[PDB]
Each structure stands twice: as C-alpha cells, then as structure tokens.
C-alpha cells in the first residue's frame, strides 16, 4: 500500500491540478477572480474499520494526521457531538503553503503543489483594490503603521522563500474563501479557565452566488489540514457545530472580518451562507439538553475520474483480498 | 518525478496485473496452458532527450539500469550494430523472480509482483506434460542424477523461499516460458550458465505464435527487459541474430533443438521470427556483409494499460514547470 494519498495515482493527480487554473475566471470590472465550477466539489473519506488492526494501522499512518486528530478531539473541539458523523484529518505537507494544500485537498483530493491557489491569492492581493479587505482587517485588528503592516501581509502571500514559503494568516483565509465563493470553517487548537479558528464567509458575494457547504479545516502547531467527512450510512448526520463547549456553557465560533452592522445581524448572516441546523446536545449543567447551531456538510461529490481516494480505496481492496 | 516506473500510476498497475490471470487459457487435453491475447503486447521507452541533462539524469536514474546497459555495451553484445535502433535496459527487481519481472515489463510495463507468470511456469512443470521438455534439456546438457536434477529444476520454479525471496531460474525455465507465451524470447548477455541466445516456442506451430521476440538482457544473475527507443529512425527496427566475434559473425545460440531441428536452424528461425537480411560494415572498410536480424514489434500497449505513457505525461508536465 502506498505511503501517501498522492502516490496512488500520480498521473490523475496531475490531471486534476491542470484543470484548476483553467477553471479560474478573471473579471475586468474589478470583481475578484474566482472559480467557475470546481469550488463545488467535496471529498469524503472511506471507512477503514472493515479491515484488521494491522491493516488499519498502515492505512492510518499513510493517510491520517493522527496527532492533530487526537489533539483536537482531546479538547472536545472535534467529533464531540453524538448526533453527527466523524470528521478525519488528512496528512498535509508542512511547507508554508499548507492552508492551500488543506483547502485543495478538501475539495479535490490533491495538494496545492502547482501553487495555483497560492498564486491566485497573491494575485488578488497585489493586483486589485483591496480597500474593503484592509478596512475589515483594521476593524478586526482593533477588536483584539497600517500601510507597513498591510504591505507585509501581501508580501507574505507571494511564492517567495522567507519552511519553503511564508506562512499565512486570518486575512489570507478570508480572501481565499472569497476566491472560492465558499465558506471556510477552521477548527483550531486553543481552555478558557486558564485567533485563526473560526468562520470565514465570502462576504464580497451575495449568498445566492456562493456554494453553501463549508470547507472544514483543522489547525494546530502552525499547520492546516482538511477535516473531511467519513462515509457512513447511517444514521448520524453530516454537520459541523458552530459553537464550542466552554465548561457549563457554549462559545460561538468567531466569525471573522465582519463590519459593524454585519456583526449585529450575525445569526441572519450565517443562515444565508450556510445551511444552519439545530442539534440537541447533552448539557454540562443540570440541563441535560440544549440546542446548538451546526452547519450541514456536503455529501461526497468528487467524480472517480478525479478522485485519488477512490483509487486509494481500490488499491486497499486489492491488497486485502490477498489475505 | 516518480522514483520508479510503477509509482507513475499505482492503480493502473494493479489493473494490468488483474487482467493477466484471466487471459490464461487452461486446456484439459494436456496441451500447455497459454495466453489468449496479452502475449501480443509490446512496450517502448520514450525519447529521453529534448530534455536538459539534470532532468535526463532524473529520468535515467529513475528508469534505466545504467550499470547493466554500460556492461553489455562495453562487451559489445548490446547495441553494437550501427544499423539498428538502440535498446535500453529498464530497472527490474532482483528478488529471484526477475526473469518473469523482466519479461512481464517488456510486454505489459509492470513487474510480476503478483507472481502470475511465476505460478503459470510452476503450474506447467508440476501439473502437466513435461516429457518432451525433459528430453530437450537432456540433449542440451549432454552437448558439453538426471531424474533428481530434473526434479529440482521443477522445484526452483516454485514460489517457495530458498539468499533472495525466490529461487533463481535457468535456460529450461526460459524455454518453457516462451511456450506459455507462444512468443520467442531472445537473451543478450556475455556468452550468447550459458543463458544468452534464442528460445523458440517449439511446442506450437509458428502459425499459432506471435512472431516478434521479447528481448531480455542478462548479467550477474540479473535479467532486465531491453526495449526499443520510440522515435529513433531511420535506424532499422530489428535485433541482429549474430554477434561480431574475433573478426567474424557468429550465430546466437538457439536453445534446446532436437538433432533434426538443428539441421534446419535457419528455416526454424524464419518461421518463428520475422528475419531480414541487412547490410553492415565489415572489418575491412572496403567491405560490407549481409547478416540476419529479427524485426522488433512496434509499441502497441494501449494507454489504458501503459505505465510508460503516464510516466511521460508526468515528465511533460514537469518539464513545462521548468
Ligand atoms: Cl555495425
Ligand atoms: Cl571483432
């Protein structure tokens, strides 16, 4: 069995990547460049328990970032609702371009190794009006020399060596979700008893022009990974919680870069860009049940012809029949 | 770029090997088990120039067994003839099953990692009619514990463990293999174990056989396939059936013939191969000689079952991003 996902079909990996820059449309009226179609794809991961412990192991060591998985689970941040389907973290290259690799993988099962997503970000930042972005960024910077700092954030987005690439931060995620026209939700390491995490909405587009399922990422130790839904059926539902447990209460995930009126109508705004559902969960006061908001997650839609996970699964079967 | 060839498309490789066992026809009437269709496939290597030497070096390090290439070239056994196309040696695992690995690669661009060819060979020697084979082997051995000696040759072909993962194979194993494939095998080495030479599927009439050879290279107990380079005309697409030897041309050995077969060697060659008579430079520069050569097949492995075309698409993609 291959030691990583991409090794299962290098040829197909390259075909996928070569579709991506041709799916990009660049407007001429100042409108941000964005994907025409591919932003709607979503990967689901197959179930591995149908095998034997030694086999599980090799599958997990190849595909799964078990360190991040375990850290986020042990904080009750990942996979804490009994109602909902398990999410698993996929390994991702830690080269500085990992926000792009994790995002690329969630949708397309390949990493950003041609820098297509990375270049799209630097492009928007370097070669259009970013006034609104800067404004929303200044607001967030003050909730917790403007020109010097803004120039640096743009420079961070380049494909220049400073780790092969400059790491990226919140505003970069925000710009990226607007290039994809698709929300990104980051589940990050962080106990209140003792900033990257949160919800990024494509607010430069009307919600009707956007894909209404999120890309879900994990973040820990300065490293992004996709958190993709495990295939099952069923009866649990595909959703990601929009709040965290905080001891006896709940703390809403941070919604990034909102302007003041937007923040006033935050719940409404969330309900436009995401498919917001209510989920009963056991209370940690005397309560026993509370309803919390969660977003619906997409069902697997990445056609086999562009799905490395399908090919990976099929290698697994072949190698398992031989036991 | 991929470290080896199979890494180019691991999934396609699995599918290729999956097709192999179901292409084997298994007669009850005692006639040897053979391939219905897949023996007619041939791989070629793609042209590795038009690239710059750091990338040409990347490719050759990845795909070419340069040590064995250099060896067979310096001893003047491989690519000695300036009139025919260059052949290249592809890396092959040396686990003891490399006769099969090399042969499997030549036709299918994959190695015999599922032991389909290995098992077919053993299945022939252990579950069918081996009278005539044992006879030809005796005849050949005496040209220089016969039941026991033959008995271990049958065991060597097994998938048992011997210090490699598998027992090594010999001349008689090659001859049986060519009759399962219904296709000649030609081995180039430094004899020309005297493994070098021509192996014809004499348990079949030539009419029921594919008349293009599988070409292997052999040195240091190691087999590799010797495949043609793709776009290299005007040179002749053929392998010579003789070597230069001390000022003369000497026929490659033809293995396991009976006496009456040997009295008509040239006729047998012309039935099982596509023999052509070609001119080459003599030792006196005032002189040309006619020699026999056997036509080599054209690349016919469809893309859907060709690891080499995927490797090349990878290479192409990488070159533009450089
Ligand atoms: Cl010559
Ligand atoms: Cl000579």
Large-scale geometry of chain B: globular
Counting DSSP E segments of at least 2 residues, the number of strands of chain B comes to 12
Question: SSE string of chain B, helix = H, strand = E?
Answer: HEEHHEHHHHHEEEEEEEHHEEH
Which H/E pattern describes the elements of chain A? HEEEHHEHHHHHEEEEEEEHHEEH
Structure summary, number of beta strands of chain A: 13
Helix percentage of chain B: 25-40%
Q: Provide the domain count of chain B.
A: 1
Radius of gyration of chain A: 20 Å
N/C terminus separation of chain A: 14 Å
Which strand-content bin applies to the residues of chain A?
15-25%
- How many domains of chain A? The number is 1
**Largest β sheet strand count, sense and barrel closure of chain B:** 5 strands, mixed
> What is the number of helical segments of chain B per DSSP (H or I, 4+ residues)?
11
- What is the structural class of chain A? alpha+beta
Walk me through what this model shows:
- It is classed as hydrolase.
- The complex is a heterodimer of chains A (323) and B (322).
- Chain A is built from eleven helices and 13 strands.
- Helices cover 36% and strands 17% of the residues of chain A.
- Chain A has one domain.
- In chain A, strands 3, 4, 5, 6, 7 and 8 form a six-stranded mixed β-sheet that branches. Chain A has a three-stranded antiparallel β-sheet with strand order 9-13-12, with no helix packed on it. In chain A, strands 1-2 form a two-stranded antiparallel ribbon.
- Chain A is an alpha+beta fold and 323 residues long.
- The radius of gyration of chain A is 20 Å and the shape is globular.
- With 322 residues, chain B is of the alpha+beta class.
- In chain B, the strands form four sheets. A five-stranded mixed β-sheet of chain B has the order 3-7-6-4-5.
- In chain B, helix 5 packs across helix 8.
- Classes of the chains: A alpha+beta (323), B alpha+beta (322).
- The structure holds chloride ion (2 copies).
- One chloride ion binds at residues 244, 246-247 of chain B.
